[PDB]
Homo-oligomer: A and B are copies of this chain.
Amino acid sequence: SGLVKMSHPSGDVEACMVQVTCGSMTLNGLWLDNTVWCPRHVMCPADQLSDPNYDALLISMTNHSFSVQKHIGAPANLRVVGHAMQGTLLKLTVDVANPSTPAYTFTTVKPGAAFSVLACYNGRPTGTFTVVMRPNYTIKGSFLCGSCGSVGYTKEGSVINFCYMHQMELANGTHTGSAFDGTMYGAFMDKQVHQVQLTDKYCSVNVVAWLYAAILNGCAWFVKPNRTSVVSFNEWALANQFTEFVGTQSVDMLAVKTGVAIEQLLYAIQQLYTGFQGKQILGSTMLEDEFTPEDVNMQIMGVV
């Protein structure tokens, strides 16, 4: 029993972190097979940060303009045999294939999904935590200067899903990054300019999962027989800054084990959005959308 912010064990990914240095700019990079991914603004000379010409910056570069160093495990310098650009990322071809490359994927997560983040500095991991892709395509992490290139991932089975590479802090505690296809979440730009965010919203499915968690941990004062259809809640959501609810088989698993219908918790959410009246839900006085249905499933009933 118990619900915490839980991240995936990071050894798989610790073995893939390196330091990327270009000119006078250093950051972190992900070393998979014969490739090292890193943010492309490592090439930007710090003063072209307001109007960077990444095409010109790339053609300007040679393969020795980049230095890749591995500080964890067995250290080595890796000779860079190729440099390429993909969206907002640099893909550097190296002469040695990473012997610790795990089975991996590059799939872009949508808002509401969760992934474990491994924060790194100078190619050295410092901490790990779990975040959620906000509806405005940001995350609420903890990053200092030089942490870009740190990677966010999940793992189902033996396969690691690499979904995030840190790039920018927009406001206090607000951050963004890339998918490993090169596209930046929310179409933000890698340039120190004015960047407006969309409005943040509560992730409906995650609140439902969190209420199911509270029930399975002996906290169910908020449950009454009343119900509210999914259409009834999505229309309510379009006016009160909530995401459109979409049922999934994990949410349905939670509903089956609690004997509490999704519609009951949607009604409960409608009632709790005003205020908890001084009561607590799993030690919280607000609705919590930091927990996905899969996360609660694995934490409460386990994936054996």
Residues of A that sit less than 8 Å from B by CB: 1-12, 14-15, 118-119, 121, 125-131, 140-144, 169, 172-175, 217-218, 282-286, 298-304
> Residue of B at shortest CB range from A72?
B11
Query: Which 9 pairs, one residue from A and one from B, show the smallest C-beta to C-beta distance?
Result: A11-B11, A2-B173, A6-B127, A2-B142, A4-B129, A4-B142, A9-B125, A285-B285, A6-B129
How far, in angstroms, from A34 to B37 measured CA to CA in the complex? 39
How far, in angstroms, from A15 to B7 measured CA to CA in the complex? 17
A4 touches B141 (CB 8 A): yes
List B contacts of A14 (CB < 8 A). Answer: 9, 11
B302 touches A143 (CB 8 A): no
Contact of A175 among B2, B118, B174 (CB under 8 A): B2
A1 touches B173 (CB 8 A): yes
How far, in angstroms, from A301 to B144 measured CA to CA in the complex? 8
B144 touches A302 (CB 8 A): yes
A127 touches B8 (CB 8 A): yes
List B contacts of A283 (CB < 8 A). Answer: 140, 286
A142 touches B304 (CB 8 A): no
A128 touches B127 (CB 8 A): no
**Which secondary structure dominates where chain A touches chain B?**
loop
List B contacts of A284 (CB < 8 A). Answer: 284-286
List B contacts of A302 (CB < 8 A). Answer: 121, 126, 144
List B contacts of A143 (CB < 8 A). Answer: 1-2
Cβ of A139 to closest chain B Cβ, rounded Å: 9
Cβ of A249 to closest chain B Cβ, rounded Å: 20
> Residue of B at shortest CB range from A217?
B172
How far, in angstroms, from A173 to B141 measured CA to CA in the complex? 25
Given A2-B141, A4-B5, A7-B129, 17 more pairs with CB closer than 8 A: A1-B173, A2-B140, A2-B174, A2-B175, A3-B142, A4-B142, A5-B5, A6-B119, A6-B127, A9-B11, A9-B126, A9-B128, A10-B10, A10-B11, A11-B15, A126-B304, A127-B298
B3 touches A173 (CB 8 A): yes
B4 touches A298 (CB 8 A): no
